[PDB]
Structure 1
Amino acid sequence: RPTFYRQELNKTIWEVPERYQNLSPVGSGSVCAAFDTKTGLRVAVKKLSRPFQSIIHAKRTYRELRLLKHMKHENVIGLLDVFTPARSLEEFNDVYLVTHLMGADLNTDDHVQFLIYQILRGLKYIHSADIIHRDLKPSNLAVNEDCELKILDFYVATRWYRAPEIMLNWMHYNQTVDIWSVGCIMAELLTGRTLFPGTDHIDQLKLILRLVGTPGAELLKKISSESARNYIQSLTQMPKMNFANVFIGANPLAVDLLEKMLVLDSDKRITAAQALAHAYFAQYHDPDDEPVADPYDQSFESRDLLIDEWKSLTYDEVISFVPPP
């Protein structure tokens, strides 16, 4: 057990071990940039805000610790450390998570290729563990000075990058909701503007369909909701736009990848693994250096437990933590 010290910063209190110095607020849980004396590197420290306030929070606290302890990939946030000032379960009420500080977020063709390749390389990994991100957006992509990128989950509206099947309230969405978001991000990097800046879920849907066109009969037959159908079919029919004409000036391979990512029917969207093998990333692609994840146990997601049970499970995960070499 190391020596802890207390400090108040931006209304929040921070009790962290001696090893972490020069705590500097970065976002408000609440995140601080800091210096790690044991390793010599800059770190990001997240203090969980009200971890065990409700069952929803307690399960979220557990889910985040479990997720971060599992992620071991260059393009995904990983845990350097996890600590609590608490010396027993009884005293346990605060969680701090430590990771590498990248320094900035996401908000040249070679630049875009490298940035998207990294997002896709990290998404191939998370999708392999049967995890869906569901909120990929520029603010959730951390970038260092070497232009190295990590996916995380930390104002820019979420709905701007959300797959149309989520806006339309479909419960059965798949992993490709994240490829949609990648398409949106890649477009924004290429042109310098938000592909679909909707003001609400209705407007957002109208903006998407303006580009990709209104659903064909094959997709319309897959929509069970009379309300989702009676809305979409009640809109003035729109054809699919020519992407070469909307993304005029861009590398034709980037336009071709955009067409494969931004397909309305999610069953027809390119996966992260297929996108990695697209001609656009020929300069980066190496199937021997795009690893998959170890099996991830997410059976807990289906459980309905008490705050104290989620709390005790989180505590054990803090105790069992083994730092990387």
Structure 2
Amino acid sequence: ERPTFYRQELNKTIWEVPERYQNLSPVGSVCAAFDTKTGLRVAVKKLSRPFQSIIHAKRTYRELRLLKHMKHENVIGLLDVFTPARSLEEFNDVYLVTHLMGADLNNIVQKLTDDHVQFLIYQILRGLKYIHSADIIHRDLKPSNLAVNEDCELKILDFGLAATRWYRAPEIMYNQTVDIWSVGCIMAELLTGRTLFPGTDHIDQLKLILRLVGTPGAELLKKISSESARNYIQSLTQMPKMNFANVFIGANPLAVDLLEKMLVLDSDKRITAAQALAHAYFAQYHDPDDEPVADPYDQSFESRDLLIDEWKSLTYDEVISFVPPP
């Protein structure tokens, strides 16, 4: 049942795709490919040297596993996976095909409507609810891995894999609430058009992050663990928690309330993805009957730290066995 493939040299690499797909422009490297089968615009990704290190081989089995498992309206889904290789010992290339959306949330920023922010933030949180229910953290949610079409249907890309310190959670710079800090950072920018914390250095970010949320209180200074984390907080000036209204001028009161609860340093007391959906701000979008959870993902392969050759064969079988969904 193997069809026929074709070569093309792009950006110093050889894209070897079947006849089924045509035209490949960069949008490792992801091409904007036009389908001739369903006549849609599919996303075609060719990975960065998939098995040329032990981690690359693991980041490949995980990515393909994560994708052949997630099934949610706001989470990228796998349509196809292929290899130009005819056998197992010739398998060194992996291709992943999804749906291609318009652009990203970084591209839709601009002064945004509170109802347009309502609909995107709701989609992000509903997408995280189905991701978190399968025990997975994005850890680097930025508007660039939040793809949107023309109708504002949103899909989360690049979950569970990984100027740059802009959206990182304080406790990580552990807990699913790491992505809730990123959600608040995107929402703040959508409501205005200004990066809440656009810091350059690792330390400066923490000084900018604590400039709005305040300095960690007596309760948290006891909760805190790390010596350098303790000896940096006590080395930086005393800062009180700022009023969100004073910075979030004109914004919907229920939008100012969510962000205040979202952007707290306390991980044990940070609003969850499931909890944030039933919040007053999303009263129009919320519906408990159409908010799906995830069918258990076999994360047993993580505790294993085997050899390249073993990862490759596991990745090999998930490609052969793959059944294309309607």
Q: TM-score range by the shorter chain?
A: over 0.9
CA contact (8 A) 2:126 2:273 kept: yes
Q: Which residue of structure 2 lines up, in the alignment, with residue 61 of structure 1?
A: 60
Spell out, residue by residue over 1:124-159, the C-alpha distance to the aligned partner (whole angstroms, 9 max, x if none): 0000000001010011111111111110019x9331
TM-superposed deviation, 1:75: 0.2
Query: Helix, strand or coil: the match of 2:123?
Result: helix
Kept after mapping to 2: 8 A contact 1:135/1:158? no
Deviation at 1:103, TM superposition (A): 2.4
Deviation (angstroms), 1:264? 1.1
**Does the 8 Å contact 1:75/1:150 carry over to 2?**
yes
Question: How big is the shift at 1:270?
Answer: 0.3
After superposition, the CA RMSD in angstroms is 1.6
Does structure 2 conserve the Cα–Cα contact (< 8 Å) formed by 1:61 and 1:314?
Answer: yes
Structure 2: segments with no counterpart, 5+ residues: 108-113
Query: Displacement, 1:36?
Result: 1.6
Deviation per residue, 1:152-190 (Å, 9 max, x gap): 019x93310000111xxxxxx200000000010100111
1:264-320 Cα offsets, whole Å, 9 max, x none, are: 111111000000001111111111111000001111112111000111111011111
**Contact 2:163–2:200 (CA under 8 A) maintained in structure 1:** no
SS of residue paired to 1:32: strand
Q: Secondary structure at the match of 1:158?
A: coil
Tell me how far 1:6 sits from its aligned partner. 0.8
Higher helix residue share: 1
Give distance in 1, aligned partners of 2:95 and 2:21: 12
Tell me, in whole angstroms, the C-alpha distance in 2 between the residues paired with 1:254 and 1:224.
Answer: 32
CA contact (8 A) 2:133 2:293 kept: yes
Superposed displacement of residue 228, structure 1: 0.8
Residues 187-217 of structure 1: per-residue CA shift (max 9 Å, x gap): 0111201101111110000001000001112
Kindly state the Cα deviation for residue 14 of structure 1 after the two structures are TM-superposed: 0.5
Counterpart of 1:164? 170
Task: Answer yes or no: is the 8 Å Cα contact 2:83–2:94 preserved in 1.
Answer: yes
**TM-score by structure 2 length?**
0.95
**Structure 1 unaligned spans of 5+:** 167-172
Q: Deviations over 1:13-42 (max 9, x none)?
A: 11101110111221xx11001112222211
Per-residue CA distance 1:71-107 (angstroms, 9 max, x = gap): 1001000000000011111010000000000020111
Q: Deviations over 1:225-284 (max 9, x none)?
A: 121101112211100000111111111111011011101111111000000001111111
Partner of 1:169: none
1:123 is displaced (CA, Å) by 0.4
Q: Distance in 2 between matches of 1:157 and 1:13?
A: 31
Alignment map for 1:46-195 (pairs within 5 Å): 46-107=45-106, 109-153=114-158, 157-166=163-172, 173-195=174-196
- Give 3-state SS (helix, strand or coil) of 1:44's partner: strand
* Per-residue Cα deviation, 1:102-121 (whole angstroms, up to 9, x for no partner): 02011191110001000001
Q: How many residues align?
A: 316
The 2-side partners of 1:158 and 1:150 are apart by 21
Conservation of the 8 A alpha-carbon contact between 1:68 and 1:78: yes
The answer to whether the 8 Å contact 1:137/1:158 transfers is: no
Supply the distance in 1 between the matched residues of 2:257 and 2:244 (Cα, whole angstroms): 8
Q: What is the SS of the residue equivalent to 2:165?
A: helix
Name the SS of the counterpart of 1:268 in structure 2: coil
2:18 is the alignment partner of 1:17: yes
1:227 corresponds in structure 2 to 228
Structure 1 stretch 106-115 or stretch 77-86: which is displaced more? Answer: 106-115
